[PDB]
Write a protein that binds this ligand. Structure first.
Ligand SMILES: OC[C@H]1O[C@@H](n2cnc3c(-c4ccsc4)ncnc32)[C@H](O)[C@@H]1O
Ligand SMILES: OC[C@H]1O[C@@H](n2cnc3c(-c4ccsc4)ncnc32)[C@H](O)[C@@H]1O
Ligand SMILES: OC[C@H]1O[C@@H](n2cnc3c(-c4ccsc4)ncnc32)[C@H](O)[C@@H]1O
Ligand SMILES: OC[C@H]1O[C@@H](n2cnc3c(-c4ccsc4)ncnc32)[C@H](O)[C@@H]1O
Ligand code: NA
Ligand code: NA
Lengths: 337, 337
């Protein structure tokens, strides 16, 4: 009754655009411990052959995961990445949860990227990633996306074809789009200069604490050097929670939702980021948004695959209330409706 | 009219029954050296994430590989192993090459086994094997196979479901079938008692030199102890060739066919065994048979996948002539054509 129809519709098009990998995750379980059974002698002429007792294929890719979670939580999200012609079923899966997939580049030749991962009983991982169609993400122009769906409220620059990451970030700077620097695995692979090129001007920087130290080491930046380039640092601390740090040093710390199981750590970070950014878009403060992100992250930790979790108001509210109090759980549920 | 009809026909029989794994091989290439970047410090908290720049899916499994090679070379072969309902195209692939697949067990529920392997530029490997339908190989009775195709000249007991390996070997002993003990990868996993149970009474023992030392260590056997249990030992020595050793110590040594490239070592041993045993079934002597096996082995070494090589009498003859002399090449081609 009190909504301005014109202005509400005007803003409805301001989506989150998620750029990053789109993949199939081929996940296997090793019924042992890599750290214990592997010995230093096995690394000098490497020949490893693990017997695995489980194998499942699931939808994945950092951008696929984040878009799935934003869509499931009710946000407005567009998936912007490269995949192969095999993508049809994945497309239907994402569209059924509200994800705009019109601007997924479909390669004429290459298959969708593949993440192959063997996880042991202690959640340690030995994995390989095949880019396939992901390399063609460097041919996506965010200008065309904007022309089609309008200026997004935020562009997430997740792990992707590296050249696509640099081009997307620079196009955000040029078009005045707010972006979240979420380089994740590429922090292990890029040079300090390249990383600096991904961070400058970011509305958000997302890393975990290890990745934060890695970024500082490789870039040669101090923390103050980074905070001069970004509006907010979000650093996940695993079971120790998450820090949200403004440029003036103001820090908000949020604890985690305790897990009922540690099934598979794949996609936990993606899910935290998706939940946090959905909460922020929905009007929640930094602390409440991080609390939502922590819930989604633990739901991914407790399931095999990255998009196999389920959203249930009653269970979500109960776990949020247990971790953060009934008032916080109520505010979170109130914005998600 | 100088042929002895009885003995001619007596020698004419050459059916080989191949037991062992049937699989799809998911092969990837790491464009670097594991040795350059994997260090003992990475064992504390194991978390490896390789970028691979090639991914292909190929027909595989040790029994599939050996049956393919025997069929391609003109031998008489039946494939005896467990697969999944996905096996249909694989079946057509093998039948088109003369392989009898009537006695492949098709699981009602499980997928064909899967070998996932990353190989670096120095041929080092990191791999995982998911048995799936392979476990159901323990339900295959060689008595039914014999009832269908008659008493084979040889049963190859290759890497398989371990219980199936034991059941097949004991059924060969009870039914009086000559068998080749080819446990290969299972030598890394079985106990000395189990290995001894696989070797006793073998017509052939096939291993590489490392596997030979491993067998001797785990079984507690000396070489003479082994030679008292088997009719012929075949020990491959990689670039140093192959030793063929009778119980009385009589040794035939054969050098290798020089390779034109070192592309992928997966299935090279399978191919040697198949070529050697086909040559023997066709009436070639030990040396000529090992020369044929060495050719097939290098053809697999030079190609991606285990069954992607091509059999061409003229190219084969030229390489055999270069390695072993025109007389040997001619004798081999004359028997196979
Ligand atoms: O966040 C979890 C998600 O990350 C996805 N992924 C896993 N490795 C990668 C890499 C990579 C690795 C070595 S070099 C580049 N790049 C881009 N996405 C990846 C995976 O598909 C999973 O669903
Ligand atoms: N993200 C990474 N680890 C966690 C945990 C957790 C708690 C004890 S062990 C792992 N709990 C919730 N979210 C997490
Ligand atoms: O010899 C090359 C062929 O061996 C096949 N293979 C690779 N690992 C195995 C294993 C195994 C591994 C760890 S525990 C048991 N078992 C049975 N076959 C295998 C593969 O499908 C390839 O085509
Ligand atoms: N490099 C490692 N093995 C080989 C072989 C070979 C021969 C019999 S089995 C493997 N042949 C040529 N080059 C090789
Ligand atoms: Na998970
Ligand atoms: Na090969």
């Amino acid at each position: 009754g009190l909504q301005g129809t014109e202005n509400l519709y005007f803003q409805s098009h301001m989506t989150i655009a998620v750029t990053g990998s789109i993949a199939t995750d081929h996940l296997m379980r090793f019924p042992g411990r890599f750290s214990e059974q592997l010995l230093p002698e096995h690394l000098h002429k490497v020949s490893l052959s693990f017997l695995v007792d489980d194998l499942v294929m699931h939808r994945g890719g950092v951008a696929g995961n984040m878009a799935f979670a934003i869509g499931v939580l009710g946000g407005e999200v567009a998936l912007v990445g490269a995949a192969g012609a095999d993508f049809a079923d994945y497309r239907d899966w994402l569209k059924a949860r509200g994800v705009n997939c019109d601007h997924v580049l479909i390669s004429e030749t290459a298959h969708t990227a593949r993440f192959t991962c063997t996880t042991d009983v202690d959640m340690a991982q030995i994995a390989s990633f095949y880019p396939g169609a992901m390399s063609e993400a460097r041919n996506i122009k965010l200008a065309d996306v904007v022309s089609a769906i309008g200026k997004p409220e935020l562009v997430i620059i997740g792990a992707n074809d590296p050249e696509a990451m640099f081009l997307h970030t620079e196009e955000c700077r040029k078009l005045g789009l707010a972006f979240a620097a979420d380089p994740s695995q590429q922090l292990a692979r890029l040079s300090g200069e390249e990383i600096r090129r991904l961070v400058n001007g970011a509305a958000y920087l997302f890393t975990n604490d290890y990745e934060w130290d890695l970024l500082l080491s490789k870039t040669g930046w101090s923390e103050a050097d980074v905070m001069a380039q970004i509006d907010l640092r979000v650093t996940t601390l695993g079971p120790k929670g998450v820090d949200l740090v403004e440029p003036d040093g103001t820090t908000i710390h949020v604890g985690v939702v305790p897990e009922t199981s540690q099934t598979d750590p794949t996609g936990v970070g993606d899910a935290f980021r998706a939940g946090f950014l959905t909460g922020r878009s929905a009007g929640l403060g930094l602390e409440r948004s991080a609390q939502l992100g922590s819930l989604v992250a633990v739901l991914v930790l407790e399931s095999t695959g990255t998009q196999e979790w389920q959203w249930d108001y009653e269970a979500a509210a109960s776990r949020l209330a247990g971790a953060y109090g009934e008032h916080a759980a109520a505010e979170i549920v109130a914005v998600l409706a």
